[PDB]
Each structure stands twice: as C-alpha cells, then as structure tokens.
C-alpha cells in the first residue's frame, strides 16, 4: 500500500542538482517542503508528495524545478490532483521514491484536524487508518475528545499486531494529548514522540527518515542483547561451554554451524583493516545459517561485561569443545 | 574521447550509500580515492577510474563496496585491467559517470614521471597528449629538461587552439616547474595552478570538479562584461539610446528582439520571489534570440557602475525609443 524504498537527499552542491535532474523520471514521486498560494492569495509553507512530470535545471538561479501533480498534502487545502512546481535549492532536503526500485513499529501521525495510522514492514508500508476530523469539531470536548478517538482507534491496532514500540508524531501539542490518552489505557507498550509539520503520507515518509527510527531500533537491539547476555552468563556457568567467546573460538563454531546467536560490540566493526572485513564476513555466515547477530553499542548495560570477554561471544547450539 | 557528464557526490549519510548502490550499473565508471597493496606488500593511497561490475551494501560496517576493473591509475603501478574493490564510506567523495547519460580551457596534468594534455568542450573532453616520462629519467637535466619538454609540447597546442586560459595542475612542485617554462615562452596567456594527487584521467576528472574551474570561468565573464560596459558607456553617450537599462525598458527591448547582449548583476537573481522567476525568464528569451547574457558578480570593477543603473542594461541592435 506504500513503498519502502525511498532515499533522503541533502542538496549540498549544484551537482546534487544535476543528479536529481538526471535520474528523476516521469512517474516517480518526491517528498519535499514547498509553498502554495491558496485562495485572496496566501503563501503557506507545506510538505507534499509530488508525482513527477519532468524536471528543469535553471542555469541562472542554479536550482531544479520539479513539475508534476500533488499526490498528497494536508486535506484542509483540498489541493490534491493540482499541478505544482517544486523549487529545489542548495540547502533543501528531498526524499526520492523511484518507480523502478527486527523491531516492528506502529506509527500514529496526528494533526489537530487529521490523522494517520500505519505499520512498516521489510515488505512495505501498510496504512491501517487514515481519515479527516475536519467536520468533527465545533466547541464542546473537541481536542480531548478527538485525541481519545485516536487513542482508542490505536489500541485496537496495537493489541491486534502486538508491535514492539509505538511512535506518536505530528505538528505541535496535539500529539502530546493523544500520548496522554493512549498511555492512560495500557502502560504496557513503549511510546515514542517526535514532530513533523503534517499528518499525511508526506509526514509519514518524513518520519521514517528521521532520527527517531534509529533510536527505536537501537533501544530494541540493546534490550534483546541484554537478556541474551544473561542467557549467556547463566548458561556459561552451567552447561558448560554451550557458550564461547573470543574471535577464533567463534570461527570454529561457525564452521560447525553451532552459533545460535552471536553478540558483538560496535568497536569490532570500526576501522580494523583486514579484520573489520573478516568479522563482517563471520557475521554474514552466522545469518546464512539462521544465526542471530546482535550488535552492541557503548550505552548498553551489557557493553562492558561483553568487552571483558574479547567483545564477541556466541551462544552455541551444541558443544564444539 | 572522454565523457563530460560526470557528477561529484559527497557521501553524507547511509542513504547516500543506498542511492549509489541503486543507480550504479554494470559498465558505469567511477572516480574515487582508494588503497592498493602492490608488490612484499605496500599499501599505497591512490585515485583511480573504475569500470563497475556490481556494488554491495555492507549492513554491519555500513559502507558500499564497488567491484570492477581498473580503467586508469598512475602507470608506474602497471595495475590497469586488474580487479579492485573500492570501499566507499560516509565522508568520502566520488565522481560518477553513468553510461546512460564560454571559456575554452587547455588543461595540463603533470606528475614527475607522467603527464596529460586535454581540452574540455561542451561536447566532451578531447585528450591531446598523454604519455609517460618514466623511461626518460636518470640523472643529468631530468626535471628542468622534462618540464621544458612538456612546456614546448603545450605551446603548440595553445597556439593551435588559442584557448582562453591554461590550467597547470598535478602533484607537488613539478607543475610549478612547468609553469616557469611555459611562462618563459609566451607571457601571452593566463596560467592557472591547482594540485591533484596524480596526472592521469582520474586526476583530470578530479580537476574538472574542483573549485579552480569556477575561478577560471568567473574571471572570463568578469572580463567580457567589463569591456562590454565600456562599449555601453561610449555607446550610451553617443548614438544615443542604442543602450537602455532598467527592468521594464529591457522587457520591451526583448519584445522587439533588440537585445544584442544584456548585463545583469548577481543580486537580481538571489531570492526575489515572482521577480527572480521573471528576470530568469527574460534571460532565457534573450538567448533564445542569439542574445548574450553576462552575469555580474560583486568583485567586477564594473559592478557598481552597473548597479547604479538599476543593475540591468542591454546593448541594443536598433532603437526601441
């Protein structure tokens, strides 16, 4: 229902511009900031998803004009289907989606008059709910009431898909309101909060490319590798060697296809010449045999215990001596 | 003899990496820094032109490995035709040349044991001379003698193509030596100097993408627009109006197809809303009728005289009243 192969790009030079001009084809979509003069006239900044028609490099002002029709924008402007021109300059950002191209997160985009619910898969992006609230507000309960309607609307999706983390995002304050609600009905899940200028498919592609996703992913991996280490310690001191550490030991273990899961600290992957390539390969081999690889960052409450043991231990399937 | 449609890219994020991985095809060429262990083993940094085979994104070390054969490198290593892997990381630069894609400058790439001569056209890059000097050195005159052999070798090409500027580039000191010579035989041309790590086709693609080209281009435009302004002043005060300035005046002039050449200061093209688009269009119209457009930067000894007159004057073909 929504592609996942998108690329964010920061226009740093005039060549970044020619590149975009050369590879952006007919029916490709682009996500970027822009201005629209709706109404009399009122110039209002906004972020839209545009399906390209054709691009134009402007020699004199040194910028790229992407021509096309608006695929998505805040519904309150009713501008979908319209033609628009995106003026891309040095300094701007843009997410491109060409046609020819372990933590499950539940995403809720909430604006004060619209909202969207979706879940990202390695496959793609499925959009559960996505509707307006525009005709639903005229004094009374409004905000609190609307937030609740979304929180409820979310709780079903969570229980129904049991995601690892919940991402609450969107333009100012309202999202904090919805957080308050959804939180008031479970306290069983981790809720994250970040802000994007709108609650549309544009804000969605924007959120996925924001730093918050990494944070959610890294908290997950840090957590799984913490319990695993416990599984390692209690197992270590009680089997015994159904656990091993040290580079060489882990290689002979790979040889036998014994590695159930391997724990490796981030350092063993940062500038290590013929080693960073070697370890790198070891790690692909482990997965090429249904092995689990959990990288370990400085901040995990298990990083030091691990580093102590050379920085790489493998929980074994069977003894290797 | 050499493509001109190349794009320089600064790897700033992991997406810059996926992008490269997605658009780099089979027989495309890439120019980048790298290391080669030639010989026993000796790891030596170098810049080569690689014809791609296939790329690989490395999930764990987060980098792209471009696989292929070496199209060009310093001849002293005799490594052309070899297979090599380029390890591209966040922080690196790369110039891509895909297969599916007013100042004439003479370029001389000189290294202490090799050199290259070429001229860039809007059409492409023609490579005049390009040979080794390797077997030509064992005590005696050597440097001075070799420099002279290149200077001579260049003088013919210059007189034969009468280029606007001469670009002397390459790795340390030797280029300064050749400058001294070539200069000692003409003092009739503008010689520029910049440095690249090698004197190959790689160093060439590198030079073309370096700041020096802009400098050469801008000095040219500043010079042509200075004499033109003189042509404007003496013409202004003596025709009379075969010269006009001011935005509106220039538009009605375009209407008649009277603009021979237009002079416009850089400011009229920097953030001017519905104007920067308007002027921009005016300028394309002038060229869409064999008109000459000379942009004017702050530093030209004619910038202020121009700005005085609204910042835009047109030398006319005939009166427009």
UniProtKB/Swiss-Prot annotation, chains A, B:
Q: Which GO terms describe its cellular component?
A: cytoplasm
The organism sits in which domain of life?
Archaea
Cell location: Cytoplasm
Main site of residence? cytoplasm
Q: Which GO terms describe its molecular function?
A: endonuclease activity; metal ion binding
**EC annotation?**
3.1.-.-
Q: Name one Pfam family in it.
A: eRF1_3
Top EC class, one word: hydrolase
GO biological process terms on file:
nonfunctional rRNA decay; nuclear-transcribed mRNA catabolic process, no-go decay; nuclear-transcribed mRNA catabolic process, non-stop decay; ribosome disassembly; RNA surveillance
User: What cofactors does the UniProt entry give for this protein?
Assistant: a divalent metal cation
Q: Which UniProt keywords apply?
A: Cytoplasm, Endonuclease, Hydrolase, Metal-binding, Nuclease
What does the entry note on its domains?
The N-terminal domain has the RNA-binding Sm fold. It harbors the endoribonuclease activity.
* NCBIfam families for this protein: pelota
Report the family membership. Belongs to the eukaryotic release factor 1 family. Pelota subfamily.
Subunit structure of this entry?
Monomer.
Q: What does this protein do?
A: May function in recognizing stalled ribosomes, interact with stem-loop structures in stalled mRNA molecules, and effect endonucleolytic cleavage of the mRNA. May play a role in the release non-functional ribosomes and degradation of damaged mRNAs. Has endoribonuclease activity.
- Protein name per Swiss-Prot or TrEMBL: Protein pelota homolog
Where does this protein come from, organism-wise? Saccharolobus solfataricus (strain ATCC 35092 / DSM 1617 / JCM 11322 / P2)
What is this protein's gene name? pelA
């Amino acid at each position: 229902d929504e592609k996942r192969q998108a690329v964010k790009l920061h226009i740093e030079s005039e060549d970044d511009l020619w590149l975009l001009h050369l590879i952006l084809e007919k029916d490709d979509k682009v996500v970027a900031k822009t201005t629209r003069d709706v109404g009399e006239s009122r110039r209002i900044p906004m972020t839209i998803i545009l399906k390209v028609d054709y691009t134009e490099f402007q020699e004199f002002t040194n910028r790229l004009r992407i021509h096309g029709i608006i695929e998505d924008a805040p519904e309150r402007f009713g501008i979908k289907g319209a033609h628009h021109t995106i003026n891309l300059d040095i300094g701007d950002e843009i997410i491109i989606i060409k046609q020819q191209w372990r933590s499950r997160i539940i995403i809720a985009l909430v604006d004060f008059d619209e909202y969207l619910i979706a879940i990202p898969f390695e496959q793609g992006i499925k959009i559960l709910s996505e509707k307006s609230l525009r005709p639903l507000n005229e004094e009374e309960g409004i905000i609190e009431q609307n937030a609740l309607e979304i929180a409820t609307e979310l709780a079903e999706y969570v229980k129904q898909y049991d995601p690892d983390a919940i991402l609450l995002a969107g333009p100012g304050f309202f999202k904090e309101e919805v957080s308050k609600k959804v939180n008031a009905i479970l306290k069983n899940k981790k809720i994250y909060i970040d802000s994007v200028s709108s609650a549309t498919r544009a804000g969605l592609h924007e959120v996925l490319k924001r730093d918050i996703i990494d944070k959610i992913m890294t908290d997950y991996e840090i957590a799984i590798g913490a319990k695993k280490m416990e599984k390692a310690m209690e197992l270590l001191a009680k089997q015994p060697e159904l656990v091993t550490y040290g580079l060489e030991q882990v290689k002979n273990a790979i040889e036998m296809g014994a590695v159930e899961t391997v724990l490796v600290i981030e350092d063993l992957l940062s500038s290590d010449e013929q080693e960073r390539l070697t370890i790198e390969r070891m790690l692909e081999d482990i997965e090429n045999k249904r092995g689990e690889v959990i990288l370990v960052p400085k901040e995990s409450p298990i990083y030091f215990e691990l580093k102590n043991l050379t920085g790489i231990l493998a929980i074994l399937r069977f003894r290797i001596n």
